[PDB]
Every structure is written in structure tokens, then in C-alpha cells.
Design a protein around this ligand. Sequence first.
Ligand code: ADP
Ligand code: MG
Ligand code: MG
Ligand code: MG
Length: 1284
Amino acid sequence: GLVPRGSHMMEILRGSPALSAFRINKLLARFQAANLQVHNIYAEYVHFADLNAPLNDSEQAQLTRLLQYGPALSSHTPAGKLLLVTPRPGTISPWSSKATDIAHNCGLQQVDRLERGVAYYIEASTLTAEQWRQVAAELHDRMMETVFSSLTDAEKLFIHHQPAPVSSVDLLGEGRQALIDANLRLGLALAEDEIDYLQEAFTKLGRNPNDIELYMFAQANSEHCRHKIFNADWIIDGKPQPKSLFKMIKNTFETTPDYVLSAYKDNAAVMEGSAVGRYFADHNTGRYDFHQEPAHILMKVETHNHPTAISPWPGAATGSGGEIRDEGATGRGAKPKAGLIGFSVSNLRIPGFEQPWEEDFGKPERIVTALDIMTEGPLGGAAFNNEFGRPALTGYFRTYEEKVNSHNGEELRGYHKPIMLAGGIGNIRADHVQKGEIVVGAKLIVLGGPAMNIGFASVQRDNPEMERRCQEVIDRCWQLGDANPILFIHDVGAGGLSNAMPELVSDGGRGGKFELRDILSDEPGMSPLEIWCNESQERYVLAVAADQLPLFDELCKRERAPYAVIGDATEEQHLSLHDNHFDNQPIDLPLDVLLGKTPKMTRDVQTLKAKGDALNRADITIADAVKRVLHLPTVAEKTFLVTIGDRTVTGMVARDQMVGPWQVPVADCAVTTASLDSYYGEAMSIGERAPVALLDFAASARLAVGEALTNIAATQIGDIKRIKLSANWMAAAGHPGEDAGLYDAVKAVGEELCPQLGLTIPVGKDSMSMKTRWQEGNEQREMTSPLSLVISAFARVEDVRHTLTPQLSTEDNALLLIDLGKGHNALGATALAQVYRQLGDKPADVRDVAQLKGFYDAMQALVAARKLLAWHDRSDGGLLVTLAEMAFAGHCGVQVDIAALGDDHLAALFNEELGGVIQVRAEDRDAVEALLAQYGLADCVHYLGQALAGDRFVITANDQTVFSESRTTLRVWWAETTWQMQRLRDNPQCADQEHEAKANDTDPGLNVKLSFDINEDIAAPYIATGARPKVAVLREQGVNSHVEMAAAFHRAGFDAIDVHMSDLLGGRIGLGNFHALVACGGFSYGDVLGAGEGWAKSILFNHRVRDEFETFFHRPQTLALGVCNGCQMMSNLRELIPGSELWPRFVRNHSDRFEARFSLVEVTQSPSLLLQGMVGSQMPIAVSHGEGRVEVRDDAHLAALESKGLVALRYVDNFGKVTETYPANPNGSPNGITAVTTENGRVTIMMPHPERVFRTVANSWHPENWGEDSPWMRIFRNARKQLG
Ligand SMILES: Nc1ncnc2c1ncn2[C@@H]1O[C@H](COP(=O)(O)OP(=O)(O)O)[C@@H](O)[C@H]1O
Ligand SMILES: [Mg+2]
Ligand SMILES: [Mg+2]
Ligand SMILES: [Mg+2]
């Protein structure tokens, strides 16, 4: 289908079936839900290749071949009305970018841009003209897509628009009315005092302000960027206040500057880490080596709220993405390590799962429902974390939408405008913590992908791989130690370049002259205002010395990370933006003019305090209360938000959400090791309790600090001063009583609580318009969020191994409760109250500062002395939930008595006061109690009872049964939410299977069977000779699992070398000098055009390199391992590998969702050399993949594979049998297949990640007697011995 397009040719190539069986059954059942009689529906992908030059015969074949991918589903001949859905015209989907890279990397330079769409074929002869428009709607997201009626209509996507000129606003010729008009038109949202500034400014200059200059100024001065509320003066109840919000927060740093390396001086904070071995490839040798040096820790937590309300997936994706840029741009370069996610929404109201407290209060048309946010949002954030390569180890998810009697009387409080939170931690070198000086004449560079028109405008666009490439460049720079060319690096986020650049030069006491036409752009038609102010993603601005340019270029190219020099640093503090096309100057301004601050903001507010009504307990019984509480999304299991995101990448994850043999998501905090050779590390926890604000502001804030602390309490940290905090404030500024409450809240923690505990707040952010106004019926309605503080705690871990979890032990034990509520048992603004549609009287609060510090100090002591068996703090759901979740984690029973907890049983069980339950060895009870008394906690400590093998959850009181149920029953109820979420989001069959497996109490959980000695380093004799064979650690743009892959081969005695595909395509390296090659995991090219396919075809199409691989595979004694993406890549290299004729393809999972699981596999009999002596073994392994399902060409191909004896690994359930049941088998591979070898066994490919779990500490769960090495370390040692 080759049709012209003015200057280029627009080729139309037909793709494979786009929708799976269950997906189609869903669409049809959804059509009838609107009375649309549709006989049958058939979707099919269609590719559109806008190419410049002609495509030769052999090249046309290679193109078609690039475009044949994905699951081999049922293919039908088109029939019915056609509806082509494609990205909206003038927009370039991320798919287009990655797919076009591949085309280029395959030598198809003629391809100007590849783009995809989905051709729907609907048979429904009954539908009217109007009913059709209704159908087209169900088939596309109006925010980013459009529907066509012809495959020809796709030409409208590659149109060449003429470069738009800069527009001037005639102030000199029309007066102030010119700025008034533009402010409205361009939508600048400038306050009267700002228009005055602009008027005087340009009057003094004597010229007209360009639109680009006005927008740039407007963006720099918005609330989001200026934070006027946080720096404003205050008058509360007719009384002037001495400090601003910011100043009060800075107070925590003044009283406690301990361990802080940087704060409020970067877009991230830095704290002291631990001296450990930083592992990376040397610049000169290309070999990975351990560098003994301090690995300081940086942190940051951001919010991408508003965007998420309009378009969830991209809104969440870019929220995490922009935050990753802030970490990477810390100082002169830093490396992101682990992530965290936060979500706050209104009631889910899941169809057919309506909860007792849920009421429909309507919502604005312009935004999406609570459910859609939780359906697409998490996938969006996880998408960026997965494709980029940083584990998502902790987070929170809370629902709240209720008409309640609060500070401003009866109102609708909730989250129609959601809280989308993303943050993380990272490592940074000591000498890079401080930003260097910007020398005059320094080249100003933009690192990242070509800009597009973004910022309806709230619909973002993420290209995670692009950022992965950029990060690799930043990594090469800081690894150059002193030679690090990066002088000053800054991230590009809000305000696009118009903000980022003026900020970079300004922070360096310089100015900058730029060239608009030096900026990389994907769409020519942009105006100077659009090229300079657009908010496209994956961009960094940095400064590099003139003489270091050749090096920076050498680095960017090797990583395929696009960059561009767009300006020069100048002496005079003056911003200049020249345009070469029109030969004019869009920007010409003195920096103090553009950055000139308007008068200080001053808020005169008054206090509002909610009356608060007693809890009406008419329909409240302890039994129904338990059932209700476990069904509140805030309390319920979060598996739908956890398994969708990677949790093992980097091989440094010690403690993830999933806990124990039964992998229950109840881990209170996250923990990572500082490196691949140390037991030190970092920790992350989250404290949040927003509902409490609807009654008391300071209390809610205090509780956030408290919970964060109690959630991290069971980790070996030491001095509390090591725990650094991040404070994120979500509020509805202007709303009655929120301003006085926010000040009171910020003060409560900034001036009082945090300084008293010795806790610093080096980072923070704000989002001040957390409200939503609309008209559902005939009148005005409003959904106001409560003041919402989200505290993120961070700390250097002393010993990663001593971290405690909620996994109970059935051995002789003692369940002790640390009740920090001091008997208060408050029920106000709790989960119990929410579950019965109420707010209640009085909420919880930090009752005694000294005891909270004492609590933490005591916990630190018990953790160091190894006197604790388990720990779980009390938060949402109360003591009931803490105990329930512990039982869930230990897969056992609980026998507790609550008579000493006060006469009010409901209160003792459902109050959300700080504290928790510790489990100690029975013989250790008295000593632990005495210790707990030493910190003055005796009155708060109460012996609850003990953990017992079984299925009974029994709560008594002096001699009466207060509550008793099947532990499995509570567990299954507690799961219903994630079950329902997975049913509507994933393959119903999978979600169901996973849910039903939890009802089977006989589940033994993950267990081990070892056919060999886990501690016998069989490679030691070899390593001892000093002779170290080199292994080619092969990566491609997008690979993110290469470092831990090299560290694994390193421990086995190899000298791992960093071999990038560019290195091969450039002749810098040759496989001839290697006896071993390993293809690493990740998301090469963002898995576009089939996971692993672009990477593989990149080799196959370049005959020189192709032969390099074939020659390697055809040698007599060479080894080759392929993990994950590598497994997928190599499976497409069958023609190059001898004895791989029977290998299968790896495609989309049956669940149709990314699976990051700790799955149990068994080592089967095969010629495989890397699995020597492991046959028969059964151990769990890291699984992070979305296209790992084995697929054969027909049953004959599968029988043939089985009879040839090529299967190396199979998934097995916890009972030991090979299973195709989910999630024990995460992808749905036939006969549990996830590893296959060749006839000679010299080549082995597999989906699981053995290299991520070679260290016992990197295993989510493992037997208590394992030493340093896990069973999987054997794979690597086997490779060394085999080489000799
Ligand atoms: N949005 C989220 N994303 C990822 N993990 C999450 C999210 N919300 C909760 N989790 C994880 O689920 C587990 C339980 O969450 P939650 O019940 O909120 O914990 P807690 O009770 O300690 O506050 C934790 O391990 C937590 O990190
Ligand atoms: Mg909880
Ligand atoms: Mg907790
Ligand atoms: Mg929490």
C-alpha cells in the first residue's frame, strides 16, 4: 500500500490481530451495556510507514519482517464497517518513536516515521447514524486518539506544517489592553500585580513583548513554580506570624542538620550513606569492577495530580518519569535506585461490587472516575518504572469520598482530583553532591528526545526507554570521577526549556544566548513559544566545558542517547533566544527582569474547627465491622498495585511488599542494599492519614510522621537522626479553614514534633488546589480533599539482613502490643467510621512525644539484639487489621485476649493510634517487657496472646469470645478488592485462579528442594589461579539488568565486560575474543515491534555483525546465556544458533499484564551445561516480564520440543506439580516452560532472573539457614568450571 504524501511516500502495511479472545468478549458485552446490537467485532493492527526515499526489494522485505510480531492469534478476513483508531493528528505516539529507532538501527534510513493504529471491523446492520458515533467512542480515548473511516485517512498524521512565526503583543500601540487581551487568549493566568510588572518592564525596554516572553514569564510565576503560598506571610485569627510555611519546614534542618549533605538547594535532598563497593564498567577497560567508595543517598517525592484527573496512564507515567529526572539530575549526576508510589482517589464503585458506604455524588465530565484512575494510573506509573528500570518497593492507596460534617459544615470531601504520588531513592558520589561552577563559554546542552507540542493539554506522553538512554549517559559521566564532564545538570519539567534553561544559567550566576533552531524537534510546525515552552518528556539541560564536548558526544552516541548543543553560557546575566529560520530574536531579556519577583503574598486567615459528632453504633457489630473494614480498598490487599511493577531489578532489593512463603503484600517498609557486595542499605516508608484532617489538622500531620516512623521501626537503622523525611502537602487553599489548618499542620511538625524527635525534612513539595467544582444536576457541587500530608521517611540501613516483617512464627511465641494511644482508643476519622459513612468525634494523635521517640529507640534495640520474631504496626484498620495481616503473612492462627485494652471492645480493636504488635520468643517475654519499660513504655505494653498453627482467628476478653472466624475467610475477604480490580483490568480467568488459590488453606507456600550443596563454590579452584575468563555482557538501548548480571558472573570468577550493541556495530569489540556471552534483560526499544525483536533483527540485518554472532555460536566450546529480554532476543536468533530449531517464541502473558512475581520453578533434565547438578532442585526466582509466555507453532512443535529433552526450567505450584495455573505459572506457558536449551546445552535461554537473586538477601523469601549464596549462584559458577 504505497500512496504519496506531498514530499514523501506513505506505505500502509497490514499487521496481526490486535485483540485476544477474552478482550473481544469484553467489548461485545460492553456494547450491549448500551443496547448496541453487534453481530461480531474484529480488531487488527495496521502499520503506517511515511518514508522519504524509495524502498528497495530486499529492504521492503526487511520492513515487512520488522512489522510481523506479537501473539499468533486467530486471523480473519475483514468484514463490516471499518473504524481506524490512531493517535490524534499532530501527535506522535511513543510506539512511533521506538519503532522508528529500530527501522533506523536496521539500516532502513528511508523510513521517516513508523506509526500504528487499530483497524476495528464491526458487523452490526441495525445501528443508526447516531448509534455509530456512540460505538466509535467505546473504541478510543478521546484525549489522545481519533477515529478514521479509511486507511487512507492515516495520511493526516504525517503532514508537513510550515514553521510558525513568533507573535508580538502590541503594548506600545494599544496600551495595557494588549497585555489584558493576551493574558486571556494565551491563557497566562496573571494576577493584576504581574500585569503591572510586565507593563512597566516592556515600557522601560521600549518594545513589544513577544508571546514567548510572556508565556515564559507566566509559567515561571505560577503557584506551581513560585510556591507563593509557602513563602507568604501569615495572619491567623488576627495575629501576625513570624515564619512562613517554608521557613517553619527549614526549621527541622536548623535543629537537626545531622547527616545531611544537601537540602533545599537541588530538586532532591542528599544524606550520608555507607562506604561500599560501587559496581560499574571502567571507561578505559569497559570491565565491571568494584569501586570502594561512599554511596550517599538522595531522595525526592513528587505529585502529578491534575494531569492524572484528566488522563490517568500518562499522568501517572510522567509523574514517576519527571521524578526520575530530578534524582538523576541531582548535583553533577546521580543514579536512581528504588521507587515509591502513592494514590488517593474517591470511591471505586466497582460494578457488581458496590460497598455499603459508597454513594454516587456525581463528577465532572472533563475528568475520569475514581475507578479509571486506579485502573489506568498504576499501570502508567508501573509502565515507566518497568521500562526504565527501578523497582517500585513501597506505597499507599486510599479511597475517600463522603458527605461529612467538617470544618466548613456539611460538605463533600474526597479526591475527584486525585493524589498521584511518585518518589524514590538513589545513590550519589561525594564529589558530585555539590553543583560545580559554570564557566563562561560553557556549552549549554539539551539531553533527551525531540520536543513535541505538550502542555486537553493535560494529556502527557511517556517514552521510558528514551530516559533509560539518558540515564546511561549520566551514569557514564559520574563514573568518570573527577573527569565527570557534567558541570551542572538540571531536569526539564514544568515550563519546558523556558524554565529549565533560565534556571540552569541563573543557578550558576551566568546568562545564556541560545539558538532556537539547534533544538531537536519532531514537528517543524511549532512556533518559538511552543518549541521553547512545551513540556515534552525525557529531557535534561546541562553545562559542559568547550573541550569536554568530544567526550560527551562519544558517550551519548554509544548509548544512542540523543543530545544537542543549543547555547553558550555568557558573562552578562542576559537571556537571548535567536531564531535562524526567520533571522530574528524571540527572546532578549535581562535575567532580573524575567525573574523579577512581584510583591510578597500575605494570607490573612481564620481558624475553623469541626464540631464532630459521636459515632452512631446502631448498625455496628464487631463482626460486620471486621467484614466491612477488610473491604475498604485502603485496608484491603494491594496486589493489583504491586505485581504490576518490577521489584527485583538491580539485584539490591532485600525487602519488597510481598512477605513470606505465601507472598502477602504487607511489608511495612522497603529495603535495598547499598551495593551488590554489602549488607548496608537504604529504607523507605510512608506515613499518611488525611481523613483525620477533616477533624483535626495538626493531628493528621503528626500521625503521618508517626506512622512513617512506626512503619520503618523494624529495620536496623540506629540513631533516629538518620531518618530523613520528605513532606508533601495536598490542600484546597482558599477553602474555608484549610489555610489556617495547613499553617497549623505545617507548624505542628516543622516547629514542634520533628525537632523534638530529631527528624529533618530536607525535601518537600506542595499542591494547593485540591478541589473540583462542577454541575451534576441543576446546581453547583464541589469535591474538596481534606488537608493531605504524605510523609516519606528515608534512612541508611546498618544491616539489611536483620529487617523484620509481619510473617508470624508458630514457634513458642508472645504477641505483645505497644499501644501508643495510651488507652485513648479514638474512633474519629478511622476506617471503621468511614466504613459506616461517618466522621466520628475525636481522632487519634501523637499522645506523648517522648514515648514515640522511646518507642523507636526500643524497637532499634530489639532489632539489634535479635529479640523480635515479627513486627507490624497499627495504621488503617486498627489492631484488628494488624493482627489479621500478621496471620495472613504467617499463614496461621491467632489467639488473643483484649480485656486489658479497655471496656470498649470495638474501640480497642479499631482505633488507629500509633504503635503495633511485636512477636517475641515465649522465653524472651519478660526481658523484652523490661526493656520496653526502660523507655517508659510499660503502661502502653500489653500481652495479647500467641500465634498458633491453624486457621483460627480468636479474639477473647477475660472469658468471653469477642470475635472468632476462619483465618482463611478473613484473608479471602481482605483480597476481594484486588480480585475485583484484576477481574476488570486483566484476564478474568487469571484473576479468578489467583483469588481461589488463597481459599485453599493447605497451601504450603514457597518451599525448597536442593539436589546440590548451595554453599560449595565449585569455581573456587579456578578463581584461585587468578585466571579470569572474560564474558561479553551484552546490552542494547533499553537493557536495565546488566550490572547485576555482570556482578553474578564476577562472583563466579569472570571478568565481565560491558558490550553495547553500538560497540559491535562500531567495531570497538569482537566476539572472537570471548568464550562466553550473556544477553541481558530489560526493555530494548521499549519492547516495540515485539519484545526482544528489534534487538535481534538489529543483529540479523547487519550482515557483518550477524556473522559475528553466527561465528560465535558455531564455535566448539562457547557458552551463551539469555535472561528475560535476552531470552526473547536470542529466540529470534534461531537461524544463527545451532540446535535451536525446536525453540518456541515468547509472547504476551495470558493474564495480559506485567508479572513481577517471586515464582517457584524446578530444574528439569536437559543437555544444558549451565544447570549442571541442579536437576531436581526446586527454588523460587525473580520474574519480571510481560511477554514471557511460551508459544509454539502447533502441537507438533511442542511434542517435538518435549521429546528432544530441551526444557530446562518449569513453573511448579507450591505443592510441587508442574502447573499452568496462575499465578504459580505467571505467564501461561504450556507445561510450565520458561527455560530451554540447545542440543549441545552450550546455549541456554530463560525468562526468570537468576542474576537478580544470586545473593540470599535479594530473595523476597528464603529459608532461614541459607548463607550468602542462593541456589541460583550455581548457574554462574557452572559456567566458570565448564570454561576451565
Ligand atoms: N500504591 C501502591 N503501590 C505499590 N505498593 C503499594 C501501594 N499501596 C500500598 N502498597 C504496598 O502494599 C502494602 C500494604 O499497604 P498499606 O496497607 O497501605 O500499608 P500500611 O498498612 O503499612 O500503611 C505495603 O507493602 C505497601 O508498600
Ligand atoms: Mg494496612
Ligand atoms: Mg503499616
Ligand atoms: Mg500507610
